[PDB]
């Protein structure tokens, strides 16, 4: 098996429309945000612009191949894969995807999709200009798949731009299960708390 | 039947172009707005930005399957389904759809489509900065299907999903159904009018 | 015949690329603007933002069907139909189409396409804040089909204009008049038809807005 | 032959990807700008917004048909035709195409494509608010085809909006052949000089 | 062979999804930015708008043909070719591609893709209005292919030969540099080119 063959088979048998549940257990999706930049904070309106890598991870056995005599990874256009229907509940603009829309697929069926995204959010910006900073919560989960079909779990400003007007004090993640008044089932989400503040001109 | 089979059948026998009338009867569409945020009010120009879930509900028996030993629901791309041609009459921008464009389909043919949308409207913003607030009316109906083909009806805490971080707060939401005859065309067209009473905090 | 059959036939045989001329005579296209809103006037730059329904009407026999025991109308995506290549000559932005892009088709082949459009125009805004108001002319015709292939004609309803106009606009409409022209450009030997819509409007008293 | 047949044949045998060179001669493309409006001048940043018809003209013999008892012209979506890969070198925004993207094709294979375009350019805006006005040069040529494959040649105030804040004093056109440090061949372009000024 | 045949063969067999590695050796990609304009500098927010030609170069043997009695080059839509998944790490907007999306292909399989791009970046704008100017670094590399699949290198071939004389700014110097980076998320190394643009406001 070479790359050409692997990619051909994947394209030929894809089913991007089919959630890869295994024996009616949920697809376990991991989500983690790597913050790159904070761009346009407004303490009056409670709005922020953020750039982040949305590290998204899951398993789709239908993509697996025997890599005994083959590459054990390929990069694949997401239009050829099933992908989780994640959305940020408190986003007030659609995601601006800054990077090539490719996922990495391992021979065992593990998938990693990690685009860089710029997006505007509605959240608590109060205190951004004090020492203890502001804490903005971002809520991400499956739009249409309940907890029996999709579960989401969480996995250092290492990637954060030194040229931002802001700095990161702390990031914490938390998992929730929510029942909305519209539907009888429960839906999982991850809440990411971003604690940040304006740098001093001197800093 | 598994999900793969159900989704394959749906895609293969699509008909996204065909309104699913069970004939002479109109497709009964339910519409309901869950307000999430109010973003950029202008009392001078009478314009507002709103974020809301557009809960849309209808029946399409051509999607039904026997779920005796199968899943009784799947998520489907709306490009593979017939979808009501709803529009907001007083919108002054096209809808910005913020969420994945999937509808939920039940084995009996019930469909739920509920995108989160950001959109700008022309409406009465006067009094927004007073105690009794402003009342902005949003009018939604089928663009091209008359009352014999599509009927729209209204379906809770008005603020249940509303953002606590908005500069505004919701005082009340009321819904109302209308049947309108336009000068251009002989038939009547239904719509729902949603009245959003809100004010600056 | 049911709706599914009618729509299937249309999709399978429609030639969206083919202007439906009958016997070397022009397709008669009717155009009419119903104004919904006037949004962002600038008297310095002579620019206006307008929202309007663009009522467009024509005949295409190739869509016809025998409706003896059938529906006599369906809604059809415009991607499955031939559509006139109308453009606004003095537009300075591309049309923002606000509504579902569907046309209504009658069993005899009559087609009605009427999207709501937001668009910016270059025109005479002078006098907008006076009693007699400004008069902005919008010019619409076929971009590439001459008068022997497409003719454009106004239609005046005999009803009041301001019927669909938003009461919440900062502006108000004094009058709307339509007029047909036939023009020959220096690039081309043939004549091209257009409709000129004259929108007479003014700013509402400032006590109200 | 009727229009339906002509259009069907064109669509079916369409090779939009193939430059229609005849016998190793370059495709001769004519370019001409008809200015409609000047919208948003900035003398500080040297930027202007312009609306113009981009009259583009060339020959593609593979489109020809016998028009003895047939129409001798049709309108065709440009997605079904080869089209020159022209670009404006000093544009700082992508072209906003305002009109239907249709070309006119004559039975002998002559093609005319003339969209109305709004676009922003980087150029010399100094003097715009003086009597002699500013002179803004727009440079247009094939992005990827050299002079042996494509040549560009020149062929307006008649179509200019009376409601613009600006007025046109003069338009001149000029053809150039240029080399670039990246490539050994020569590339043709047209430079259009727009001399304009702010009205009273 | 004529152009029509060459283009037909390429379209029919190209495999835009398949990275053209030759025996486990990485595809060698060359990247070089030719700056055309600097448009909208903001020293407060550390943001700049740049227009540049992104000269991108690589080899794909699967495109080769015998040109004995044929054209030895054609222009090809990039949708019919494999193309490197290059991204600018510090971009804060998606690339606005200003030119026709065509690549030039030589009969031996060499490809040149050079679009003009307008894009906004986050970088160090301090000193832009001084004599020594600001130095803005732009970082470009493969988003998903590691050093064993794609390597990126600067070309060894004027700082402003193509730069607009009508810009409010002027270029003092351009330097390029190659890096190999390991991120915390992944075990492999990823190559990039860092382009340093030293520029200042004209007097
Ligand atoms: C079976 C319910 O299907 C749905 C279809 N669209 C949206 C939702 N939402 C409510 C559930 C939680 N996610 C937010 C949107 C649910
Ligand atoms: C024959 C009626 O067909 C139509 C096609 N497009 C738009 C409309 N409208 C008028 C009916 C009510 N909705 C507004 C638009 C009607
Ligand atoms: C020779 C007819 O071909 C043409 C192709 N595109 C545009 C035009 N125009 C001139 C005729 C009138 N409409 C404006 C543009 C003509
Ligand atoms: C082998 C030359 O192929 C090319 C592929 N893309 C762009 C260019 N350019 C440089 C030559 C002149 N046009 C501007 C862009 C050249
Ligand atoms: C092999 C890991 O697959 C990946 C899929 N998408 C993005 C990345 N990134 C990490 C490597 C360097 N480029 C940034 C993004 C990695
Ligand atoms: C339509 O079909 C019916 C048969 O059901 C036929 O008898 C009738 O004459 C047809 N009408 C037209 C106008 O062709």
GROMACS .gro file of N, CA and C in nm, chain B residues 4 6 16 22 33 36 41 61 63 71 93 95 116 141 144 153-154 156-157 177-178 190 196 199:
model
   72
  207UNK      N    1  -2.571   0.415   0.862
  207UNK     CA    2  -2.516   0.419   0.728
  207UNK      C    3  -2.624   0.393   0.623
  209UNK      N    4  -2.962   0.417   0.663
  209UNK     CA    5  -3.063   0.522   0.668
  209UNK      C    6  -3.016   0.647   0.592
  219UNK      N    7  -3.479   1.737  -0.253
  219UNK     CA    8  -3.473   1.863  -0.178
  219UNK      C    9  -3.555   1.973  -0.246
  225UNK      N   10  -4.898   1.673   0.159
  225UNK     CA   11  -4.978   1.551   0.160
  225UNK      C   12  -5.115   1.594   0.110
  236UNK      N   13  -3.840   3.168   1.767
  236UNK     CA   14  -3.707   3.226   1.786
  236UNK      C   15  -3.666   3.220   1.934
  239UNK      N   16  -3.060   3.478   2.176
  239UNK     CA   17  -2.933   3.451   2.243
  239UNK      C   18  -2.861   3.581   2.281
  244UNK      N   19  -2.737   4.792   1.868
  244UNK     CA   20  -2.857   4.874   1.854
  244UNK      C   21  -2.824   5.016   1.809
  264UNK      N   22  -4.309   1.284   0.527
  264UNK     CA   23  -4.324   1.140   0.539
  264UNK      C   24  -4.234   1.060   0.445
  266UNK      N   25  -3.933   1.073   0.431
  266UNK     CA   26  -3.808   1.042   0.501
  266UNK      C   27  -3.824   0.926   0.599
  274UNK      N   28  -3.189   0.281   1.475
  274UNK     CA   29  -3.190   0.415   1.535
  274UNK      C   30  -3.318   0.485   1.492
  296UNK      N   31  -2.992   4.244   0.616
  296UNK     CA   32  -2.871   4.172   0.579
  296UNK      C   33  -2.911   4.027   0.560
  298UNK      N   34  -2.889   3.629   0.636
  298UNK     CA   35  -2.861   3.558   0.761
  298UNK      C   36  -2.716   3.511   0.766
  319UNK      N   37  -2.819   2.859   1.466
  319UNK     CA   38  -2.801   2.988   1.530
  319UNK      C   39  -2.765   3.091   1.423
  344UNK      N   40  -4.198   3.449   0.717
  344UNK     CA   41  -4.288   3.361   0.643
  344UNK      C   42  -4.227   3.300   0.518
  347UNK      N   43  -4.230   3.214  -0.118
  347UNK     CA   44  -4.296   3.182  -0.245
  347UNK      C   45  -4.414   3.086  -0.237
  356UNK      N   46  -4.695   2.857   1.204
  356UNK     CA   47  -4.755   2.882   1.334
  356UNK      C   48  -4.649   2.891   1.442
  357UNK      N   49  -4.676   2.970   1.546
  357UNK     CA   50  -4.589   2.980   1.664
  357UNK      C   51  -4.599   2.853   1.748
  359UNK      N   52  -4.219   2.827   2.903
  359UNK     CA   53  -4.090   2.875   2.853
  359UNK      C   54  -4.052   3.012   2.910
  360UNK      N   55  -3.924   3.027   2.942
  360UNK     CA   56  -3.868   3.155   2.987
  360UNK      C   57  -3.809   3.227   2.866
  380UNK      N   58  -4.975   3.521   1.459
  380UNK     CA   59  -4.984   3.468   1.323
  380UNK      C   60  -5.066   3.560   1.234
  381UNK      N   61  -5.019   3.582   1.111
  381UNK     CA   62  -5.092   3.665   1.015
  381UNK      C   63  -5.111   3.597   0.882
  393UNK      N   64  -4.892   3.320   0.477
  393UNK     CA   65  -4.888   3.325   0.622
  393UNK      C   66  -4.753   3.370   0.676
  399UNK      N   67  -4.029   4.143   2.017
  399UNK     CA   68  -3.923   4.139   2.117
  399UNK      C   69  -3.917   4.270   2.193
  402UNK      N   70  -3.463   4.624   2.656
  402UNK     CA   71  -3.410   4.753   2.694
  402UNK      C   72  -3.263   4.744   2.733
   0.00000   0.00000   0.00000
